[PDB]
Amino acid sequence: AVHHPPSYVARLASDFGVRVFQQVAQASKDRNVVFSPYGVASVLAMLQLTTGGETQQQIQAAMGFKIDDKGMAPALRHLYKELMGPWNKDEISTTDAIFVQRDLKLVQGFMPHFFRLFRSTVKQVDFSEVERARFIINDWVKTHTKGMISHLLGTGAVDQLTRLVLVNALYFNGQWKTPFPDSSTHRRLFHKSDGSTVSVPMMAQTNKFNYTEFTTPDGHYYDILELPYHGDTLSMFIAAPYEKEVPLSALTNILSAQLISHWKGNMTRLPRLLVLPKFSLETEVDLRKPLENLGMTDMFRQFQADFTSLSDQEPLHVALALQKVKIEVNESGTVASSSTAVIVSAREEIIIDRPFLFVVRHNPTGTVLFMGQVMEP
């Protein structure tokens, strides 16, 4: 059943990534956000190897662990093997790469140490050939997201001073354990934050669902539904206020990877009619401010950043950190992918007709792969 090491680091990773999400959401009160906690946790994990001094200590203290501590790296490998194994039935793919300047002088034993811990691709690039460089990176991401995220990097995102790009790619294809009958899909009104409404396609089905009620500090009641994928390892949690007028921010402000696990332990299966909007969302988040707010200021500062674990040839700083994410939810299931990059450079009836939260979780490990807020399907 459940294995301690994969679950140990899943828990650390998920808490971190979910705290990042909370920052993104607090910065976009009334817009759709889809986000990948495991995506960002993955890349920042690799970044721990490349950094030193205070830059490194800030990352580590924010993540709650040190990648080079005994067992941590092996646990992360075991985690993604666990996530990808056929026994889940529903399909997860997750891949890590790094693209480094061809003529960059690296610290001795780096690359071998990095390959030993992460087993990822290392590829030599010539960032001076700028357009070819970001074609190389964009094409790798596209491949490892099954065509879903093709153009991760825009123009300018990479230039002559680029020395290293660390990238994760994640792909999820899940089938509901019980699909929503197509004949049950109908137009219905959806109530937005600003009090107005809009008609959107919605899916309905009656089933015995994992469920619990939950209340915020202000007393407000929330419905928490757990929707299973056919493999019985993955689920999507849906959380929405009982009343129409309560802002979703109430939930997101107290949302933790810990509170999600508490929800899971407190669910009971009850017969219910569920009407849930179909939604297809795509987001592109700049991670700079989110990560600074969690205490990683040094790495972005070109006169303060420490990448001495990677190279002493010259001073390096993070020019850009981003995540692209996409998700499609329909009658048959859920398709989701995300790609996160850090660029291092030189110099009863439950009708969900109001904004709601979702979390895609692998339950044996406790890994949050995706989460978002749907403000308008």
Amino acid in position 242? Y
Residue 341: both structure tokens together: 């990059």
Residue spans per domain, the chain: 1-171+282-326+337-339, 172-281+327-336+340-377
d(CA 241, CA 224): 9
Q: Strand 33-35 and strand 367-374: pairing?
A: antiparallel
| b/e 181-192 (16+ beta carbons within 10 angstroms → b) | eeeebeeeebee
Q: How was this structure determined?
A: X-ray
Q: Do domains 1-171+282-326+337-339 and 172-281+327-336+340-377 have the same CATH topology?
A: no
Contacts of 141 (CB under 8 A, 6+ apart): 149, 150, 152, 167, 169, 339
Top-tier CATH class for 172-281+327-336+340-377: mainly beta
Distance from CA of residue 145 to its chain's centroid?
Answer: 14
d(CA 96, CA 121): 7
Question: Does domain 1-171+282-326+337-339 match CATH 3.40.47.10?
Answer: no
Phi-psi region of 311 (alpha: psi -120 to 50; beta: other; left: phi over 0): beta
Q: Strand 367-374 and strand 356-362: pairing?
A: antiparallel
Residue carrying structure tokens 């034993």: 109
**Torsion angle, alpha carbons of 43, 46, 50, 53, to 10:** 90
Handedness of CA 371, 198, 204, 172 (dihedral sign): negative
Q: For residue 155, count other CB atoms closer than 10 A to its CB.
A: 9
